[PDB]
Write a protein that binds this DNA or RNA. Structure first.
Length: 91
DNA sequence: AATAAGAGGAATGGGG
DNA sequence: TCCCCATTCCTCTTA
């Protein structure tokens, strides 16, 4: 099954939900969620995973925070903004 | 207050 | 057995 960070990277590469997520500085791997349209993206994540409950942005970001220690995705000190690692971006 | 982002401990669930 | 990779629930903090 696809990992959350790869789901997000794939959306950014495909442009499929441009009103929900976008690059801020693509060369640095920083990206930002839409305040108003992030829930539709969270719903898509849960449906893709076949999860029992409806996915929410809060639960998706709870998972995102678990990448902080291993490095794939880190929170940036800007609203709704995160950053992929160079390793993640190289693949 | 109302709204909302940010956080994480802890329990619970996936699929090896 | 016990780690993988989350998901779900709950409470607290910050803006």
């Amino acid at each position: 099954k696809i990992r959350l960070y790869q789901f997000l990277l794939d959306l950014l590469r495909s442009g499929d939900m441009k009103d929900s997520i976008w690059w801020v500085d693509k060369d640095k791997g920083t990206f930002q969620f839409s305040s108003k349209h992030k829930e539709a993206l969270a719903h898509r994540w849960g449906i893709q995973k076949g999860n029992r409950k409806k996915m929410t942005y809060q639960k998706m970001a709870r998972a995102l925070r678990n990448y902080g220690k291993t490095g794939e995705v880190k929170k940036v000190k800007k609203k709704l903004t995160y950053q992929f690692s160079g390793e993640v971006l190289g693949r």
